[PDB]
Structure 1
Amino acid sequence: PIVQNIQGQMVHQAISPRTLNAWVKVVEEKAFSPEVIPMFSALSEGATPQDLNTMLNTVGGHQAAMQMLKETINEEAAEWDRVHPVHAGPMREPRGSDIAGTTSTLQEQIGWMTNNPPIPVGEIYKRWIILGLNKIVRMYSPTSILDIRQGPKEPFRDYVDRFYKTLRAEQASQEVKNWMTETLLVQNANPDCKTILKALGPAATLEEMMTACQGV
């Protein structure tokens, strides 16, 4: 975080090791639950980008999640760069990587955050990190198939492929994944295909289903 000293200067305040301790525990206990996001946002109140990164590599053991977070950060950074075109000539305005803390110093971070007008790089980067965590949660959650729907015009075989791919990426028990495939494949098919599929009979299986809806 940031604190004002008696000179008026805005200076760094380390995130308490007890705040870090609490963050690692939340992750150990609730990893991939949506509850992680609000906790992260509260834990990281007032964070500079460096603070955010301190928090991030404290759970660095989540190699798979970390690569996904980073790919998402890179994407938001590029979008920032897009809508804030650079301008040479001559504090510099931050690029995406400066907001992510990769190409900026702590001093520069404090400088943007407390400038006039201020550029809240801490809040921007926290939002980007939230986008990454949401992606991860969403991909891993059983809830990801409950809401899948075959498009109104979507070819049934395309839908099937998407269905199984989404299911495969979920971290869920086999019993739940089996219940989903047996129930929700036909249940979440579009209006026109559903009708066709139900009329086949309860013993109808995947290949007959795809032939029956082929063309629609």
Structure 2
Amino acid sequence: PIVQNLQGQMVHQAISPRTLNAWVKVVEEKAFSPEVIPMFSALSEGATPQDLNTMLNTVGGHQAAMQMLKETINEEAAEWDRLHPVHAGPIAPGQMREPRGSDIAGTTSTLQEQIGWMTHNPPIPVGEIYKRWIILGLNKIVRMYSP
């Protein structure tokens, strides 16, 4: 995640193993139950896309759901690209590039790039955009997996 250091700057720090394991354990115990979404939300505080793929990729089991989510993440990403067209002409030397759906999904962007966008002024909340897609896709799952 990207956290504030004592000095008063935003720097990246790694997520903790008993945080990781707590994510694992939630999924083990409460599967598709709604409490998973606030839980997720708390444990995703200050998290990167990269950390969010890590969390999704580290799941075991419920592979039908994991595939449905993936496909929701790509749909929501396809929709990001649709709604926000690429911008006019070449990229400025003085500036950094606008993200695509796949940069938001973490796929086409690097960590330093993910830190550029979030730490820069104005900052862009690429975590929160992926977060809604995850929560939206979580609703899809919850609604389906209701019996």
TM range (shorter): 0.7 to 0.9
Alpha-carbon deviation of 1:50? 0.7
Separation of aligned partners in 1, 2:12 and 2:77:
24
Separation of aligned partners in 2, 1:9 and 1:106:
17
Separation of aligned partners in 1, 2:15 and 2:62:
21
Q: Secondary structure at the match of 1:103?
A: coil
Alpha-carbon deviation of 1:7? 7.2
Structure 1 stretches of at least 4 aligned residues deviating more than 3 Å after TM superposition = 4-10
Contact kept? 1:2, 1:11, Cα under 8 Å:
yes
Contact kept? 1:3, 1:13, Cα under 8 Å:
yes
Alpha-carbon deviation of 1:71? 0.7
Alpha-carbon deviation of 1:5? 4.7
Q: Secondary structure at the match of 1:80?
A: helix
Q: Secondary structure at the match of 1:68?
A: helix
Separation of aligned partners in 1, 2:130 and 2:83:
16
Q: Secondary structure at the match of 2:107?
A: coil
Q: Secondary structure at the match of 1:59?
A: coil
Alpha-carbon deviation of 1:132? 1.2
Separation of aligned partners in 2, 1:45 and 1:25:
18
* Cα 1:44–1:113 shift into 2, 3 Å: same
Correspondence 1:135 to 2:147: no
Higher relative contact order by CA 8 Å / sep ≥ 6: 1 or 2?
Answer: 2
Unaligned runs of 5+ in 2: 92-96
1:43-69 CA-to-partner distances (Å, cap 9, x unmatched) read 111101011111111214332111111
Alpha-carbon deviation of 1:8? 6.3
* Cα 1:137–1:86 shift into 2, 3 Å: same
Q: What is the percent sequence identity of the aligned residues?
A: 97
* Cα 1:37–1:86 shift into 2, 3 Å: same
1:6-64 CA-to-partner distances (Å, cap 9, x unmatched) read 77663311111111111111111111111111111111111010111111112143321
Correspondence for 2:125: 120
* Cα 1:89–1:39 shift into 2, 3 Å: same
Larger Rg: 1
* Cα 1:68–1:87 shift into 2, 3 Å: same
CA-based RMSD of the aligned residues comes to 1.8
Separation of aligned partners in 1, 2:35 and 2:101:
27
Separation of aligned partners in 2, 1:111 and 1:8:
17
TM-score normalised by length of structure 1: 0.61
TM-score normalised by length of structure 2: 0.88
Contact kept? 2:3, 2:46, Cα under 8 Å:
no
Separation of aligned partners in 1, 2:62 and 2:138:
12
Separation of aligned partners in 2, 1:133 and 1:95:
22
Q: Which segment drifts farther, 75-84 or 2-11?
A: 2-11
1:123-164 CA-to-partner distances (Å, cap 9, x unmatched) read 11111111111111110102xxxxxxxxxxxxxxxxxxxxxx
Q: Secondary structure at the match of 1:3?
A: strand
